[PDB]
Design a protein around this nucleic acid. Structure first.
Ligand SMILES: Nc1ccn([C@H]2C[C@H](O)[C@@H](COP(=O)(O)OP(=O)(O)OP(=O)(O)O)O2)c(=O)n1
Ligand SMILES: Nc1ccn([C@H]2C[C@H](O)[C@@H](COP(=O)(O)OP(=O)(O)OP(=O)(O)O)O2)c(=O)n1
Ligand SMILES: Nc1ccn([C@H]2C[C@H](O)[C@@H](COP(=O)(O)OP(=O)(O)OP(=O)(O)O)O2)c(=O)n1
Ligand SMILES: [Mn+2]
Ligand SMILES: [Mn+2]
Ligand SMILES: [Mn+2]
Ligand SMILES: [Mn+2]
Ligand SMILES: [Mn+2]
Ligand SMILES: [Mn+2]
Lengths: 494, 494, 494
DNA sequence: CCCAA
DNA sequence: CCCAA
DNA sequence: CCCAA
């Protein structure tokens, strides 16, 4: 069944921000499996406990983008997420009209690993064929995206996009009103915005934007959208301005507006990908496959010169993930001679850009970690700068690398981790069990603060301490006991 | 004999604009073989008929350059061209002094296919050796070309360049005066300019410019010329200015002048080819030959990224045929997996630039033209764009592709073809025989206009309708009957 | 022993400017072997003769840099150099503290060929690993070099850097005061500057700059130096300014100052090499080794296009030896088909840039030098332009190529060689023996000038004429007779 | 080798 | 094929 | 690996 696949995707595969297909933003130690549909079915049925504050807060995660900009990912509290996933699954025969959208390329699908929503799983050549077919006969292209799409979704517009704005306002129950209520309860009983990273909020964004896609399709516009980014192919410039006007109208019906910084009109024939994609791919040392494994093993000079050229391209242009793409080009074709030099280059670059930190794990097995203690200083310096820069992806990834490889962590950098106080880094330190007393003091300060939302911001740390029998449940409800008795661990071992 | 080779080259190989060696501007359906020496010798002997207007007009052809600029090629009326070719050949012992010019790189030669004049047949490495030898010891280079060379040749300067300006003016018969008269009769009895595309007018341009080459050679200038483009290599900047002054003097003796837009002086060592030639060739996926056919078959990613990089370089520089060179680099090394994707890229690019339309025929055999009817809309959209842009090369090439592959043509674009009214497109539609009535109405309107020059502009269409016995001969002379009786078809089948 | 290796390095390997490891600035006909420590020990013991002028002048050599700038190399007179080398060797247990410097990368070492000091023998990958290790954790890099380092070394600062500035001034014998006196006698009894090219003056520069390296190391600065170029890696911009201030202080203690033109602060991550290094290496046709000799033999088009792209990169940037690196990339991977075309390209480029003249000797064997006399005009034109530009490296290299390949030299270019009057070109003409009378007139004019320094500027020519018994010794001392009796030839045959 | 002029 | 949105 | 400084 496909409805059951929705349930398993919502809880076990796309509860955490696992939407990135190439490499996960969150380290693989955190996971959402062994959280079955039956367990959320029990949690939604549970009525015990009482909370002074309406709604729930979420575990916060600040991931660096290509330009070192923070992106706010959220892990929803399992009570609110269990109710939301239950209500989404129980009415998928009313919701699955977002599956049959030809203008939304990123949408729920029945994938092999189980995830409904994977960003950029379709790969650039299937994108290339479609972009070539769409761009034919048109001489202008429009790139326009919503300004704050996920962060300013108005939750009460969820009923509107289901049944029309006017009919929903006149009717002021239906399933989408309850979906509105549950999506509000997911984030502090707040109507504006949705959490970023779970697939329930991406489903909500698909539900809202599918009405705009429908009313743009009915006017004969040939357009594609990737989440919030609309690309349009127009024969004339006036049709481009008319598409922009109609898109602004239909988004303004749902309290949404265009990002006019990124909204631009270019003259076809433009590059199908970005410019730096083609510049890196013509200069790539692995752009030709020789079908024998010895011939495509790159020497040290080739990889080093490609990485320096990529650094120059990223510094000169700065309009995309040049370094990310470039290191992912040449990281699997190394031989054992240049593993250490490329690892040193990646260590320097991953210090200078935290987004390149997750790559080290694919080269961390071949490099001898002990060596002359130098890599311990490497990782501690990266940890310290990650604490100063208040980034979560690099910080958690570096802690994962230190713990998984039995690499010692200094006390001063533990103190600045405490001062940073991001939830998932503290969950990793809790899993280390060395710093149990300092984690105890931190969660104790959260407890005597007496704020429900501050406990909700660290529910994952509190539940991980509860699962190893090191802390009582801060909540008076039985959701944590239901999760523990039925075996839910968010840091599972093999 | 070399004189006989001249006559066969003039009639069967270089009557049509066939000077491009890589790919013909005119589709292969139009041809000038089965127009033997004997038929031209008969037509020159014919004295029947009468014409109210002196001279003849020519079939007009508008070919897009690299920057989408129209270039006017002309197909001379076979009476005038037959007389002109006979007069050129019968005195080749007086004319062949243009063969022994070391400064004219493009000139008549005894080629394998039969053509006397092929532009850029020597290839860039034989050009490289000569350019390296010429550039040595000189630190300045001059690039200067005639402003409107073929379009502003004075016909009366043809006797001058044979016997001196002053001697010919004092003498005011000689063979060059009759060559003047015949070159005038080729284009409406007009002294100014020559038709572009036949080799008789290129022979005339060689005759005129060889005197300038002689009086530039006598002063010791080391220079080369490609038709009208003069390159010069000077040790000093003042020798460059003196070469420019002497070239201006000797061209002004023949009512000719330099294009000072393209006249520029650069500092050696400059590159032998253009810049984008070098950037395309260092980034080319086929720049190394592995001597086995499986290893140099390019994958889809390599060709797609090279074409995208070529599009970026053509947009950024815009100083040459970047896209033409780039697709000719990688079009023969494809495998069957990327054939359809490259065809889609070529279809989009050939819509955006008509000069890339002739390439499609090398990939039109492998691609299934029926498919899901999409390629018919591709070709019809390209046809409508070609009719809007008033280009003849892409429009006739697309007609050739539609007719040769049994691809249907919509009626609206047929009406827009007739509105355009190019001669060779109407010849192709005549060859299709579906649109016989509309072509009949068009040539009937031309007939009731009662203008000799308007019939001469479409003589090829009129003769093709006469050859299939669908229209009477508009001319009262017997040249068309001589051509029909002895078997001249300008759309011959194999 | 390592002290003996110092002696053999000082006399037989690094007396001449042989510090460049890739290709020697001086042609290999000039050499300093068969000049053993015994002969220099004899010359230092010799007390015969008398000189009116204190000190000695040195043979002058003007080598073009990458930007065609003249660099002044000097060949020290063998009396002064023998005394200086003996005094350097006899106290190496006091001097070898420059060997144990971790901040000086170019320093004396026990090399395989025998040289103590080779510029950039470490190769760019060993530099890459060290640069990656140093660049970690730092976000600013400082590049600062001494303004006139070798040309404005104060000789009296040689004692200071040995024993402290204040102690040496208070003491105003010690071995470093005698090293001061001998380094003064090496160049005209002048305190400012040292000759460039011998290793004794590089030893002196290491001695002076090691105190600055020590007092920069004691402050904890992580820095490297290549002769006079200091690179520093600072976490903060303030520490970068503090490093610049302290470097200025410690250099000003020794009458030295930074070149603020080349002193700059860049933001890490910057490229390990220069930019054009990476651009040339991603576009290099030989960047992949296929481990079979037939597959990496480059075709003509690849080398021609790479050289054209390199010419464009050198013209566009002009910040390094783009052409030197580029031709050294692809000169050993040629096959016999493109040898002549690449040799012609090198002939044109080596005319336009004399630095590329030494490369011709690696392709001069395969190219037939007789041919149609054209290469004789090539070499004579290059000789003439080398005479006009007053450059010594290309001029002497071209004389070496003409003499070694039995290529005739015209009389007019011999006359402008005479007018230029560089010493090593005249030594090569002396070795040719054709122009013995003109060399005799030139040295006779030097003799009747009656200036000791003007004889010292051509001591190499005078000694080479003495060794073939064609001229008497201009000096009244017995150093030349000691050198002749023990078999010292600076133009030795195999 | 593969363009243009 | 290998990014992002 | 292949330059410079
Ligand atoms: N790992 C994930 C999971 C989900 N999303 C969602 C949230 C974003 O709203 C949407 C794409 O929108 P943008 O990245 O363009 O971001 P915004 O719309 O918030 O802002 P802006 O237009 O200013 O960039 O993708 C994401 O970015 N990253
Ligand atoms: N297929 C052909 C056959 C012949 N020619 C001739 C006619 C041109 O006059 C000549 C070369 O001249 P240019 O292309 O430089 O063009 P013009 O001299 O007419 O103009 P301009 O200098 O403005 O470009 O080559 C051509 O261009 N194309
Ligand atoms: N063949 C050789 C042998 C030795 N050196 C030395 C002398 C130079 O002083 C030193 C490097 O310093 P710079 O080339 O930077 O030269 P300067 O310090 O004299 O000048 P500037 O900073 O203006 O370039 O290397 C050299 O350049 N070439
Ligand atoms: Mn957005
Ligand atoms: Mn977006
Ligand atoms: Mn012209
Ligand atoms: Mn310096
Ligand atoms: Mn021209
Ligand atoms: Mn320097």
């Amino acid at each position: 069944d496909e409805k059951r696949h929705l349930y398993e995707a919502l809880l076990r595969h796309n509860y955490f921000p696992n939407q990135k297909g190439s490499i996960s933003e969150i380290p693989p130690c955190f996971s959402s499996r062994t959280f079955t549909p039956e367990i959320a079915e029990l949690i939604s049925s549970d009525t015990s406990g009482r909370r002074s504050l309406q709604g729930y807060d979420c575990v916060e995660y600040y991931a660096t983008r290509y330009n070192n900009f923070p992106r706010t990912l959220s892990i929803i509290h399992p009570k609110a997420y269990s109710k939301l996933a239950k209500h989404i699954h129980d009415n998928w025969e009313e919701i699955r009209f977002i599956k049959e959208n030809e203008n939304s390329m990123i949408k729920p699908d029945m994938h092999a690993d189980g995830r409904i929503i994977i960003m950029n799983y379709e790969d650039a050549e299937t994108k290339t064929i479609r972009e070539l077919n769409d761009g034919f006969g048109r001489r202008f292209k429009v790139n326009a995206d919503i300004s704050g799409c996920f962060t300013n979704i108005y939750s009460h517009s969820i009923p509107w996009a289901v049944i029309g704005v006017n009919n929903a306002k006149i009717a002021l129950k239906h399933w989408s009103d309850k979906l509105d209520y549950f999506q509000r309860q997911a984030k502090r009983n707040e109507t504006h915005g949705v959490p970023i990273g779970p697939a329930t909020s991406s489903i909500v964004c698909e539900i809202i934007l599918s009405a705009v896609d429908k009313r743009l399709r009915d006017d004969g516009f040939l357009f594609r959208r990737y989440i919030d980014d609309y690309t349009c192919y127009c024969k004339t410039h006036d049709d481009a301005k008319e598409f922009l006007h109609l898109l602004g109208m239909e988004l303004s019906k749902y309290k949404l507006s265009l990002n006019l910084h990124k909204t631009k009109i270019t003259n076809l024939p433009g590059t199908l990908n970005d410019n730096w994609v083609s510049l890196l791919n013509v200069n790539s040392p692995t752009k030709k496959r020789f079908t024998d494994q010895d011939l495509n093993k790159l020497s040290s000079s080739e990889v080093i010169n490609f990485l320096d050229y990529a650094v120059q391209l990223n510094t000169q242009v700065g309009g995309g993930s040049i370094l990310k793409y470039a290191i992912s080009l040449v990281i699997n074709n190394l031989d054992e001679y240049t593993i250490t030099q490329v690892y040193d280059y990646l260590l320097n670059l991953s210090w200078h850009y935290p987004m390149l930190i997750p790559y080290l794990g694919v080269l961390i097995e071949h490099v001898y970690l002990d060596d002359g203690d130098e890599y311990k200083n490497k990782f501690n310096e990266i940890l310290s700068m990650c604490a100063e820069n208040k980034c979560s992806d690099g910080m958690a990834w570096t802690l994962y690398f230190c713990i998984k490889n039995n690499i010692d962590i200094d006390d001063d950098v533990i103190e600045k981790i405490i001062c940073f106080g991001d939830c998932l880094s503290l969950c990793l330190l809790d899993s280390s069990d060395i710093y149990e007393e300092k984690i105890n003091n931190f969660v104790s300060d959260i407890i005597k603060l007496d704020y429900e939302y501050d406990i909700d911001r660290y529910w994952l740390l509190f539940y991980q301490r509860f699962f190893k029998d090191k802390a009582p449940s801060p909540y008076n409800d039985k959701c944590f006991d239901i999760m523990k008795g039925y075996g839910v661990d968010f840091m599972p071992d093999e």
